[PDB]
Design a protein around this ligand. Sequence first.
Ligand code: NAD
Ligand code: NAD
Ligand code: NAD
Ligand code: NAD
Ligand code: 566
Ligand code: 566
Ligand code: 566
Ligand code: 566
Lengths: 268, 268, 268, 268
Amino acid sequence: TGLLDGKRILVSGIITDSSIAFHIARVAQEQGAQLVLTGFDRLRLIQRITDRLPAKAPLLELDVQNEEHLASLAGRVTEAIGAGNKLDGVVHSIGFMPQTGMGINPFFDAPYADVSKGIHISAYSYASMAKALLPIMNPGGSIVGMDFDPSRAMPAYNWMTVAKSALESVNRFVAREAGKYGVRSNLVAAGPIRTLAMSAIVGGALGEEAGAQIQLLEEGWDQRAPIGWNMKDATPVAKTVCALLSDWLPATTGDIIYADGGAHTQLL
Amino acid sequence: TGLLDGKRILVSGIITDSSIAFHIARVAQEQGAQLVLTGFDRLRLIQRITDRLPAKAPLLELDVQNEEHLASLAGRVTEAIGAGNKLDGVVHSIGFMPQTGMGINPFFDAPYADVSKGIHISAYSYASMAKALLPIMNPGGSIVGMDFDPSRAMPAYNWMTVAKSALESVNRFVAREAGKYGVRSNLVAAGPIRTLAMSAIVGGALGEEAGAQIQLLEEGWDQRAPIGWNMKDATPVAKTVCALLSDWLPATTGDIIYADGGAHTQLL
Amino acid sequence: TGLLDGKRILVSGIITDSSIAFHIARVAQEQGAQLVLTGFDRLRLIQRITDRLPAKAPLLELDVQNEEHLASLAGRVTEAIGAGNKLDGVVHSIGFMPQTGMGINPFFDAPYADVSKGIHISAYSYASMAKALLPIMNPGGSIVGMDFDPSRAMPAYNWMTVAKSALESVNRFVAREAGKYGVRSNLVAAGPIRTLAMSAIVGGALGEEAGAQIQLLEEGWDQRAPIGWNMKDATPVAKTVCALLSDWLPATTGDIIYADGGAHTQLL
Amino acid sequence: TGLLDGKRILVSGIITDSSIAFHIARVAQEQGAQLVLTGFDRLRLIQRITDRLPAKAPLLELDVQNEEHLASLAGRVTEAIGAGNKLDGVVHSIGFMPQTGMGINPFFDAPYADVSKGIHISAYSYASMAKALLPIMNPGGSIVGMDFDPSRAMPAYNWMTVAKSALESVNRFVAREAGKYGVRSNLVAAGPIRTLAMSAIVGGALGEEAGAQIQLLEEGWDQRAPIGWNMKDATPVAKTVCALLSDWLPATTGDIIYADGGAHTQLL
Ligand SMILES: NC(=O)c1ccc[n+]([C@@H]2O[C@H](COP(=O)([O-])OP(=O)(O)OC[C@H]3O[C@@H](n4cnc5c(N)ncnc54)[C@H](O)[C@@H]3O)[C@@H](O)[C@H]2O)c1
Ligand SMILES: NC(=O)c1ccc[n+]([C@@H]2O[C@H](COP(=O)([O-])OP(=O)(O)OC[C@H]3O[C@@H](n4cnc5c(N)ncnc54)[C@H](O)[C@@H]3O)[C@@H](O)[C@H]2O)c1
Ligand SMILES: NC(=O)c1ccc[n+]([C@@H]2O[C@H](COP(=O)([O-])OP(=O)(O)OC[C@H]3O[C@@H](n4cnc5c(N)ncnc54)[C@H](O)[C@@H]3O)[C@@H](O)[C@H]2O)c1
Ligand SMILES: NC(=O)c1ccc[n+]([C@@H]2O[C@H](COP(=O)([O-])OP(=O)(O)OC[C@H]3O[C@@H](n4cnc5c(N)ncnc54)[C@H](O)[C@@H]3O)[C@@H](O)[C@H]2O)c1
Ligand SMILES: O=C(Nc1ccccc1)[C@H]1CC(=O)N(C2CCCCC2)C1
Ligand SMILES: O=C(Nc1ccccc1)[C@H]1CC(=O)N(C2CCCCC2)C1
Ligand SMILES: O=C(Nc1ccccc1)[C@H]1CC(=O)N(C2CCCCC2)C1
Ligand SMILES: O=C(Nc1ccccc1)[C@H]1CC(=O)N(C2CCCCC2)C1
């Protein structure tokens, strides 16, 4: 009798055991969902990581920049979940920006080829994935993507911020298409989570000033959040994604749900 | 094994069987919640209405303009749910504006005494109720109020719009206080629902032009909503309130969740 | 050949030589405007203060809570500017909240009578003044009010924040009415300005914690602002108000212009 | 004694006599500005068009996708305005999206190469131009770009909406860089203007449904606007751009000014 009982859900974006998508997948399985996973490039690694999930889940390769992967995706999913079965949920937990577009590298010095790759993977692919999967989604279904509130500029996030602004806009158009299928489309705007890469950035991977700025941001986030914010714990974010995958937010689409401790509602 | 199993939840705002709060109460009981109800003025009526709910629930009198009712409320609730027990949830589903502040009556002609009464009941009372009940709420608890998106002006809603703008602001401050108790505070911004009064307004109760404008608004709402909007069905709104009352949005506070078909995310 | 040449403009809100409205009045006169001033309660004081303005300007009494003052206001203005002449501009620079609604006094402990007085003076009066003056305003005219961005909660501002949220909503409805006269209505959302009272609050007038919080807010504001923010200098705010009073923002109404150094566009 | 007396301003984006940038250039010259113009591809045409401006202005070639044009731009501008002189203003009035990304062509069918070209020209180039020109801008200067409010999805605008969402985000980062030079960066969000291309789209150039939808949008815009909206008249938009180029909005940056009749502040 889990929140997601009987639901078939595709989860993208796992690359380490600290990936937000790993925690989404775990909580969804704890709540009764049957998963299909998609992974990029390092499939041996991803299989070994996802062996630790509560239940077995087929892993499919998906490079969202690869037109062939996208064209075959729905057939490969149907194969994995069985003919006559469709998906009830899709989780997009995919993002990337070349180093030139983040950190201490000057904003103006990011070449457009780099920015374009970042926007391709982080924003356009939300539409790509919806295009591929809506034909095999059930009415009442739910597409969820991960967001980091880009309403205001900030240090170091630079062109990734721009990519998230694009993603929010893409989400509102995907909602128009998804609606034709009886499917919702929404983003979860999460507070900062210490994934491997984030600890790497805080450790100086993209410049000392960038690391210092991110630590300041994390500290301010917990301070502003009326219920606090634990950057080491993705479970509250995973639960929020599962809420959107469930039947309990049936009139919300094209929208953004903030799983950020309430920080964005407070100035100081 | 309901969404709200084991939870003790106070629901205000029932006055007819079409009240949004009636549907909130029904769905919460279907999902395992144990309720306490509060009602204003017509308690015989409200008891008879709430006899139709799936389970029994104590009814307490609460006029939010009455300082004595508010001062005694927590003790009366504790009496009803038993010493040593606290609330896990509170639903504010209360609103009012004198006729001078809505409909075809000119915006400039509403006397401040009338506007002030409207803001008292519709906005300040969200803080009043939180003040009264937070001392008897459990960590992990949830306070939810009902909103109608006031971000833009519109015909006829007039000073009630202003009251909702005030309420949204109040909610962000209540979140600061509630956080000290481990409690969340949020609003659900619902699309238009045909309560008794709304059918009365559409029927011309506050002027012909106002009724005509509201019908146009309802029609445009369903058109804009990517998944449509059924003004005759409060259940999607009730489900959204229950989602916020649950454990599945644990990192959302001071915030607004839109149960409006996605209409506010679309221009046309 | 000033920005406001030939324009007749009413300016409310002067009480000291540090009032934002004093600087609005000064800059408007430097730019060729002919002013009428309104003052509350201490008219001897206000006359002596406004003697320092670049040019003479009639002072009229206006308590916005006084129905008689409002009913006579248009006639008294016409008397001062001469029959057959109308106003081109109106500046609302009026705000008040009792001490119970601000500072370290708990948010929940503000009595509604106090909150209501604050909302009356700070929000409803924007509509009151528009109602009184639109009948004596020229097409192409402009009504401007002062705002402090209430989109997010913050320490100490408490119920004044709620009042500003109400004011923003009121402004969008006043724009609907003003449009019938060919008149615009907008707010200027200013950064923090060290008026007498603010220095008093920073000095602890409403509690030590409140003063400490406001200093932190001021410091963060200048840090966030990409062009910086000087809380001791109201002239940039006054210039912005004059821009809205001019003919150079002819397609902006119901809106908010931010004269805040850009701080609200930046997270950190 | 014009609004922009003595100011040296670069204006991009003229391609016909109906271009918003043509009207910006005309009004800026009427107000005393000395201009430098930039044009894309059809320089004979653009010269012949700009011969009709009130005063002479040097025309320089600038394809914002051309790295060489951008690298040489500042030197070519300095040549045109004379060594030792710098710019006080820059107007970005540049936008493009391939047909696959707009109109009746399905949202999901736009190839990323097309979307990327659109985002390059419509969003990234705002940063490109700022990078090129900030080194030759005076303190107190102003960079202004043109926006179409992308906060909500709408029919037909499709990926251009996404490009504008990206542009708004870019603007907030350009403000951070520009601030180092004492320069402001802002967008003007205009209502719909009947440029040549728009009349072409309304005439069905991108599909009948798209044309029908745009006409509906135009009609609704004028209806919602409290002061109305004339899609045939760019002058109110041009005046707003000149307001931002002036000294009268000195504390506004990273921001968006709406020259849209107030339509975005009203639901209906
Ligand atoms: N970590 C945070 O603080 C934070 C906050 C808010 C939102 N988010 C978002 O959450 C999502 C997941 O990020 P994360 O922090 O868990 O990091 P992560 O590195 O664990 O996940 C990013 C994922 O994107 C995948 N990816 C990259 N290029 C791809 C491609 N071509 N095709 C398919 N997949 C590709 C990576 O393989 C990886 O699995 C991203 O959208 C991120 O922007 C993260
Ligand atoms: N109906 C809609 O279209 C709609 C849309 C969005 C939000 N809402 C909001 O939902 C809430 C419930 O409204 P509804 O449409 O169900 O109407 P309703 O008339 O059924 O409920 C309003 C309730 O407020 C109560 N109330 C009034 N004065 C009170 C007082 N002094 N003390 C205590 N309670 C008092 C009434 O008794 C009634 O139960 C309100 O906040 C309303 O603004 C309604
Ligand atoms: N100081 C800031 O940091 C700041 C920032 C943003 C906006 N504002 C706003 O600017 C406006 C002016 O504030 P200020 O900081 O210049 O302070 P101020 O004290 O100089 O001005 C407030 C004015 O309101 C007047 N007022 C109060 N009650 C009145 C009544 N009953 N009738 C008529 N007038 C009445 C006072 O007499 C005074 O002139 C207010 O709306 C304020 O909220 C101030
Ligand atoms: N027309 C409207 O309804 C409307 C509304 C709001 C905002 N806007 C914006 O106003 C701006 C001007 O648009 P317009 O309506 O005047 O149309 P327009 O066609 O007259 O102007 C667009 C300009 O972009 C230029 N451009 C395209 N590719 C370029 C490149 N590679 N390098 C340099 N310049 C390039 C074109 O040559 C043209 O001068 C655009 O940003 C547009 O999005 C237009
Ligand atoms: O990078 C991240 N946060 C952050 C905040 C401020 C300044 C710099 C960085 C987080 C948020 C986010 O989208 N991430 C992505 C970045 C791209 C690769 C995958 C993870 C990680
Ligand atoms: O009044 C309502 N909708 C509406 C929309 C546009 C114009 C006029 C009216 C709905 C939304 C709302 O808060 N309601 C309240 C009004 C006050 C008494 C209780 C119900 C009913
Ligand atoms: O009070 C003010 N700022 C502030 C910010 C954070 C916390 C506490 C106070 C400023 C802004 C404002 O509206 N003011 C008004 C308050 C009421 C009387 C007139 C001046 C002064
Ligand atoms: O295309 C435009 N408006 C519009 C609105 C709704 C649906 C479809 C179109 C306007 C706004 C805009 O950015 N334009 C640009 C588009 C790209 C080339 C230059 C002009 C023209």
